[PDB]
Amino acid sequence: HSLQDPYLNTLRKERVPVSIYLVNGIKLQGQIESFDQFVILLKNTVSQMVYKHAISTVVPSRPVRL
Amino acid sequence: HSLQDPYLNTLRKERVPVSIYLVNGIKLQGQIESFDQFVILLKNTVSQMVYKHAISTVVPSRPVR
Amino acid sequence: GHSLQDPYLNTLRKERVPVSIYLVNGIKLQGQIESFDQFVILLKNTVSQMVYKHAISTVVPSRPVRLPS
Amino acid sequence: HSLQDPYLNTLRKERVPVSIYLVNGIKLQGQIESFDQFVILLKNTVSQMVYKHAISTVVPSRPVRL
Amino acid sequence: GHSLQDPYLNTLRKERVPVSIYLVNGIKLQGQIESFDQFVILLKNTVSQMVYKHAISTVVPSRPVR
Amino acid sequence: HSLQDPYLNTLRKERVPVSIYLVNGIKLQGQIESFDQFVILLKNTVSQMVYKHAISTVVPSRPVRLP
Ligand SMILES: Nc1ccn([C@@H]2O[C@H](COP(=O)(O)OP(=O)(O)OP(=O)(O)O)[C@@H](O)[C@H]2O)c(=O)n1
Ligand SMILES: Nc1ccn([C@@H]2O[C@H](COP(=O)(O)OP(=O)(O)OP(=O)(O)O)[C@@H](O)[C@H]2O)c(=O)n1
Ligand SMILES: Nc1ccn([C@@H]2O[C@H](COP(=O)(O)OP(=O)(O)OP(=O)(O)O)[C@@H](O)[C@H]2O)c(=O)n1
Ligand SMILES: Nc1ccn([C@@H]2O[C@H](COP(=O)(O)OP(=O)(O)OP(=O)(O)O)[C@@H](O)[C@H]2O)c(=O)n1
Ligand SMILES: Nc1ccn([C@@H]2O[C@H](COP(=O)(O)OP(=O)(O)OP(=O)(O)O)[C@@H](O)[C@H]2O)c(=O)n1
Ligand SMILES: Nc1ccn([C@@H]2O[C@H](COP(=O)(O)OP(=O)(O)OP(=O)(O)O)[C@@H](O)[C@H]2O)c(=O)n1
Ligand SMILES: Nc1ccn([C@@H]2O[C@H](COP(=O)(O)OP(=O)(O)O)[C@@H](O)[C@H]2O)c(=O)n1
Ligand SMILES: Nc1ccn([C@@H]2O[C@H](COP(=O)(O)O)[C@@H](O)[C@H]2O)c(=O)n1
Ligand SMILES: Nc1ccn([C@@H]2O[C@H](COP(=O)(O)O)[C@@H](O)[C@H]2O)c(=O)n1
Ligand SMILES: Nc1ccn([C@@H]2O[C@H](COP(=O)(O)O)[C@@H](O)[C@H]2O)c(=O)n1
Ligand SMILES: Nc1ccn([C@@H]2O[C@H](COP(=O)(O)O)[C@@H](O)[C@H]2O)c(=O)n1
Ligand SMILES: [Cl-]
Ligand SMILES: [Cl-]
Ligand SMILES: [Mg+2]
Ligand SMILES: [Mg+2]
Ligand SMILES: [Mg+2]
Ligand SMILES: [Mg+2]
Ligand SMILES: [Mg+2]
Ligand SMILES: [Mg+2]
Ligand SMILES: [Mg+2]
Ligand SMILES: [Mg+2]
Ligand code: NA
Ligand code: NA
Ligand code: NA
DSSP: OTTHHHHHHHHHHTTOOEEEEETTSOEEEEEEEEEOSSEEEEESSSEEEEEGGGEEEEEESSOOOO | OTTHHHHHHHHHHTTOOEEEEETTSOEEEEEEEEEOSSEEEEESSSOEEEEGGGEEEEEESSOOO | OOTTHHHHHHHHHHTTOEEEEEETTSOEEEEEEEEEOSSEEEEESSSOEEEEGGGEEEEEESSOOOOOO | OTTHHHHHHHHHHTTOOEEEEETTSOEEEEEEEEEOSSEEEEESSSOEEEEGGGEEEEEESSOOOO | OOTTHHHHHHHHHHTTOOEEEEETTSOEEEEEEEEEOSSEEEEESSSOEEEEGGGEEEEEESSOOO | OTTHHHHHHHHHHTTOOEEEEETTSOEEEEEEEEEOSSEEEEESSSOEEEEGGGEEEEEESSOOOOO
């Protein structure tokens, strides 16, 4: 988790808009509200729970630093 | 489970209708009756048992805390 | 595991409740649960078969059944 | 594996013709030559090692008893 | 693991048997197995490629092996 | 981890251009900036975090030294 956790935490704390892409090709958009080992809480209209096992890639709207 | 459990449990307790989206694009709907480490029981006619490994997202029909 | 899944499958097993088992690729199987363990479900009817749980999305009983408490 | 292991072992010992369906819908056919925790070695003109993670169902050509 | 997979892959590696590796999405990769660990297989050719076992359905040797 | 980690570390230190194929057939291109047990940070027009569980293959643009 030495990369994933600080990365997700940075996006969370700075409230960076992100896109989360799913394995079926669906694009979800919002901000990382929180996360644990297995899931990410993505906010916009409501805060939906996204299982990491379904995610292919997380792409921030702007570059960020760790 | 610091987040998954309390979130699912809040949805369960408040009886909030949800959409559960499967990794193949299928959409399920109902209320969460119960859950464990590996499954979610989704009610609305007969209950159905949904394997977490097949779920992409759980989306509440209204915001919760 | 787990605390909900096993008694639910065992209830379908013991009561011979006919079920639909949907696979991750959209295939629907139908029969009765004859047996199961941690990783597989043995499904019987027209033909008997072993189903890996990793390929299953949902199990839907033909009628309501008692849920685990 | 209380059920999986004796079931695969019986198909093996009794040379039962089986059909193996993969998660992508491909059907493989033959007989179980051997297996371990993660893979099945399938035979019949073409020997191949199949990863259990890609298998949806194993369907024998006649019922087995355990 | 394990008791079948490892000697099977190791035999293919030592004997430099050309193999076909089918991915879960139906793509076929070809080459010779250069190396492997618990999670990946390195498939040697022009450039080698690192293949994640979780993406593999079957390994199919070009010739019967033992 | 004996093969995977030094292989990615080589790609990373040497900044080798790579293609990353996802299990759904999508091809990503760039360079490996960093990685851990579960994710790879892929640098292109902007960095993106890719879960290893969604990756099928990693193919360098030129031959590299193997572990
Ligand atoms: N996490 C998600 C969200 C949506 N979708 C796909 O996108 C479609 C539509 O999603 P959405 O934009 O949320 O509109 P819906 O009102 O859910 O459309 P419908 O319920 O009629 O399917 C769904 O059927 C589903 O196939 C998906 O696969 N995964
Ligand atoms: N401590 C952990 C555990 C897992 N994960 C992420 O969550 C995914 C695993 O989620 P899970 O739902 O538990 O896995 P499965 O869907 O069962 O995948 P598999 O069958 O390959 O085990 C991993 O790929 C990893 O990306 C993580 O970030 N940190
Ligand atoms: N958990 C589920 C539910 C259904 N489906 C897919 O959605 C299709 C139709 O949904 P549904 O009406 O719930 O099932 P069926 O009774 O088979 O549909 P129909 O009677 O319209 O053929 C099914 O064929 C199945 O491929 C799925 O993949 N996973
Ligand atoms: N566990 C299963 C069972 C079936 N199917 C798909 O369902 C299709 C047709 O089902 P069925 O007729 O039962 O199997 P077939 O192989 O088509 O039998 P046959 O061609 O001899 O009629 C198969 O091609 C297979 O891809 C699947 O993907 N997973
Ligand atoms: N384990 C397997 C076996 C086959 N297939 C798919 O089935 C297709 C056709 O099967 P096959 O006749 O074996 O095609 P080839 O791979 O081209 O076989 P060959 O060139 O040796 O004739 C393959 O291309 C592949 O997409 C697959 O997805 N996974
Ligand atoms: N490990 C791989 C390699 C290929 N593909 C699929 O196969 C398609 C094309 O095959 P190929 O021609 O070999 O890939 P290209 O992207 O066109 O690269 P190149 O032609 O230079 O090999 C890709 O779009 C990709 O969807 C895949 O999913 N997994
Ligand atoms: N004790 C267990 C272990 C796994 N399982 C189920 O089996 C799935 C994992 O099976 P598997 O080991 O075949 O997974 P893959 O990594 O092969 O996809 C989990 O997602 C659970 O649904 C279970 O129900 N109880
Ligand atoms: N601690 C856990 C264990 C499993 N799970 C769910 O159950 C599934 C178990 O699959 P594995 O056996 O491969 O771990 C995961 O894919 C995940 O959806 C979870 O969400 N939290
Ligand atoms: N202890 C175990 C773990 C996995 N398995 C099998 O191996 C596959 C699981 O692969 P995962 O390694 O990715 O855990 C499944 O087909 C499962 O039935 C097993 O048969 N015994
Ligand atoms: N010890 C291990 C662990 C995993 N594996 C293979 O790797 C798969 C899981 O890899 P992932 O961690 O990438 O999901 C298993 O299903 C199995 O095919 C193995 O062959 N030996
Ligand atoms: N030791 C480890 C642990 C995880 N992994 C990667 O992280 C992913 C974790 O998902 P799973 O737990 O579902 O296997 C694996 O699919 C694999 O690609 C790895 O490559 N080596
Ligand atoms: Cl019910
Ligand atoms: Cl191909
Ligand atoms: Mg599950
Ligand atoms: Mg699993
Ligand atoms: Mg897991
Ligand atoms: Mg696994
Ligand atoms: Mg796996
Ligand atoms: Mg694994
Ligand atoms: Mg690593
Ligand atoms: Mg995986
Ligand atoms: Na598992
Ligand atoms: Na009942
Ligand atoms: Na798929």
